[PDB]
Amino acid sequence: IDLTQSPRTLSLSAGERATLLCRASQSVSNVALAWYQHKPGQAPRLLLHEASTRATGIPDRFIGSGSGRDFTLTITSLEPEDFAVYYCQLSGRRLGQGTKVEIKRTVAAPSVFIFPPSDEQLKSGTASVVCLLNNFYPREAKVQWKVDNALQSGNSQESVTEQDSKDSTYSLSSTLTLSKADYEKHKVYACEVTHQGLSSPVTKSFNRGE
Amino acid sequence: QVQLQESGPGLVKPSETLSVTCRVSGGSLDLYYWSWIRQPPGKGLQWIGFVYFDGSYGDYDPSLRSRVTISADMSKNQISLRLKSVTPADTAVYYCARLGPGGIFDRWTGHYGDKWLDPWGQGTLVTVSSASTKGPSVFPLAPSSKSTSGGTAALGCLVKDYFPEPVTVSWNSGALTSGVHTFPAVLQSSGLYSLSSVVTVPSSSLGTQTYICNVNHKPSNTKVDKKVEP
């Protein structure tokens, strides 16, 4: 006996109604179904049990309904605070694949900064250039590493934040790591950023020695 | 007012036995089930098993039942999960929680309370590797004039080449929380996690307020502080 959630992914502007489905392989009584909100880095919390009985202390905008095999978590009006992944489970507690819920919002352009490699890290024989994309939306963006106007590959590596629970923007970090031998055979280390919120792509760059 | 926290080894070697312990800190185990839920690095909440508080009845995910046993010391108020023959598959954050319907007590015939999972609590990460731990090398992300964008400046620390997760980064010993994005670690092809952590602050405060990041890596008993200066 199994448990099927859908959609797997859901991007909705703040304040709109969101509907989440959890579908059993079989007939089940209301009692054994429960809903869980799992914000990233917190511990997962009970939203609802016995399919409709609201958990203690969780707001009214979370409503639960259903019978038989189609169970339905309803967010009547999304608050940005709802960015999470919402799971469901049966009695002896096995399942739910969940539903990652963005908060869709306005296009917001990233603010960009570069940081040169530190004096301390250069003494160890490795140079790291870090490029920053801060508080932007929608999630997708392009970082292009340009070293004396030449493109990089495979020695840049990047990470992006989980969605900010209050203004629903994303922040991104692209780190270029080279050995000091490589860092010094070029002069100008440049980071070019492409995003919806940016008219044309922006480039922030320094010349080795500053 | 119940509350609980899991803890355990920060690392396990291949083919060993992984254990994790959960300690109930607001009430007793009395008349409840206690269950274990794992979240692998990319996946959702895999259920592992639960055990009745008194230890007579338990149920587990049959994928793991052969290599899983869960016990509870009603006196110590702690529950132990014991997963044999661990592989890097089992590399995951292990969550601990409290099963259900009010639980209610049952005989040996009918164990017919089980309904919901209330308090969960952060639970603990267990990497599983034959590698040996390494310490962070913390450097400054200096707010140079290429990090001066009008009246706001950005600055941070680089936390490079460590193992295994986690590290804790804090700013000015907990004082600074606004404008903090401590990024996710990125597992390099070397096998090592690496991470920056940034804070944006007013340009005017650069010469008045000093900024120091507090990196902490319990798997190597590394704690460094690094001042950020021009």
Residue numbers in the entry:
A (entry chain B): 2 to 27, 27A, 28 to 210
B (entry chain A): 1 to 52, 52A, 53 to 82, 82A, 82B, 82C, 83 to 100, 100A, ...
What text does the study give?
Env is a trimeric spike composed of gp120/gp41 heterodimers that has evolved a plethora of immune escape mechanisms to evade antibody recognition. SF12 recognized a glycan-dominated epitope on Env’s silent face and was potent against clade AE viruses, which are poorly covered by V3-glycan bNAbs.
VH gene segment mutation frequencies ranged from 17%–25% of nucleotides (21%–39% amino acids), and VK gene segment mutation frequencies ranged from 15%–21% of nucleotides (20%–29% amino acids), intermediate rates of SHM for HIV-1 bNAbs. In addition, SF12 shows an intermediate rate of SHM compared with other HIV-1 bNAbs, with 21 and 19 amino acid substitutions in the heavy and light chains, respectively. (C) Superposition of VH-VL domains (235 Cα atoms) of unliganded SF12 (orange), Env-bound SF12 (magenta), and core gp120-bound VRC-PG05 (green) Fabs, showing differences in CDR conformations between SF12 and VRC-PG05. We conclude that the SF antibody family achieves substantial anti-HIV-1 neutralization with an intermediate degree of somatic hypermutation and no evidence for autoreactivity.
